[PDB]
């Protein structure tokens, strides 16, 4: 067979230890999921420094805690805009997930609170910014570099899926790089607790699994498809399915055909053909052996999963450190006021926040 006695016993033991870890992690998650933390700071505890990003209902700002001097990333959501954009449930759910999960590659919610006008999520500041910018700048990542990041996503999805959470918005834009070169996943706006199937059309076109495009009920296997897209994009510099308009992207996704750059190793192509598998009865991560088909694949043969989890592997890339509080890895935005009305808005809708 492929393994002698010692190696097979070691692998079996490692896999049993994962089960034991996940069972404890679920117990811890469920306690926080059922009794969420609320109201752990207030706005005047922080100095505003700079806007890191701005979008439909909110903004992310670099802030400094006045007493410790620690920097944080504060997401500010305007309650009235959340209601108008039909995002109440997603907003409450994102905060409930963030305060309940605990994993080294998931961003930590350090404080949360609300006032008359806004909701505030104070998260760790991750100064390397988005993987997206580094990838577009460098062009593509070598296979060992891509593999280092891929391994973190595999472990993070193994964790999330054990909690019955589907993630649904994997892409380089959503992965931040910390000062040690490790990944931080931040955005849980599309995540859902799903033990079986779900039906919502959500995600980003290049990363959508075929079953989402085809308006099927779908499961956590969509995240394993998305991992294939991410690994491909990291190693090639462009995603596997692209075109001028989304409908043409969707035709390519459902076709069952994918082409690879000539520099991809055979091991990488084999892994990707098994992740980017249209047929759900054949897709890695969705078979009887679950995540182990991925973790035990030849492309990951050099990966020490525990050492990745313990953050003991030297990262292949460390973002330029320009001081605690430097913002060079985020874009520049016009600075707008943080208005707090004298009257409470949408109180009932956000009681749980």
């Amino acid at each position: 067979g492929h393994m002698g006695n010692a190696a097979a016993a070691k692998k079996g033991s490692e896999q049993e230890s994962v089960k034991e870890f996940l069972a404890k992690a679920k117990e811890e998650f469920l306690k926080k999921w059922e009794s969420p933390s609320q109201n752990t700071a207030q706005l005047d505890h922080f100095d505003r420094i700079k806007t890191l990003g701005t979008g439909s209902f909110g903004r992310v700002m670099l802030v400094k805690h006045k007493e410790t001097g620690n920097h944080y990333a504060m997401k500010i959501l305007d309650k009235q805009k959340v209601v108008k954009l039909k995002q109440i449930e997603h907003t409450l759910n994102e905060k409930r997930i963030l305060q309940a999960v605990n994993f080294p590659f998931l961003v930590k919610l350090e404080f949360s609170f609300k006032d008359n006008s806004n909701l505030y999520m104070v998260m760790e500041y991750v100064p390397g910014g988005e993987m997206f910018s580094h990838l577009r700048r460098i062009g593509r990542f070598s296979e060992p570099h891509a593999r280092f990041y891929a391994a973190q996503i595999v472990l993070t999805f193994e964790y999330l899926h054990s909690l019955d959470l589907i993630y649904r918005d994997l892409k380089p834009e959503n992965l931040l790089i910390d000062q040690q070169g490790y990944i931080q996943v931040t955005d849980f706006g599309f995540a859902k607790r799903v033990k079986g199937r779900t039906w919502t059309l959500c995600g980003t076109p290049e990363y959508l699994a075929p079953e989402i495009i085809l308006s099927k009920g779908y499961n956590k296997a969509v995240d394993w498809w998305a991992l294939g897209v991410l690994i491909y994009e990291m190693a090639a510099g462009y995603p596997p399915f692209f075109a001028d308009q989304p409908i043409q992207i969707y035709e390519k996704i459902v076709s069952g055909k994918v082409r690879f750059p000539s520099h991809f190793s055979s091991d990488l192509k084999d892994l990707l053909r098994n992740l980017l598998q249209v047929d759900l009865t054949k897709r890695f991560g969705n078979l009887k052996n679950g995540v182990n088909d991925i973790k035990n694949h030849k492309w990951f043969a050099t990966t020490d999963w525990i050492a990745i989890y313990q953050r003991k592997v030297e990262a292949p890339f460390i973002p330029k450190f320009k001081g605690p509080g430097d913002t060079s890895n985020f874009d520049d935005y016009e600075e707008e006021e943080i208005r707090v009305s004298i009257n409470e808005k949408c109180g009932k809708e956000f009681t749980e926040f």
């Binding site: 577009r136 995600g203 075109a243």
Partner: peptide, 18 residues
């Protein structure tokens, strides 16, 4: 080439969700 096709797609920047 595939890379040139990617540039031509106009989808090299940050991508929005559906």
């Amino acid at each position: 080439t595939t890379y040139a096709d990617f540039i031509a797609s106009g989808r090299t920047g940050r991508r929005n969700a559906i």
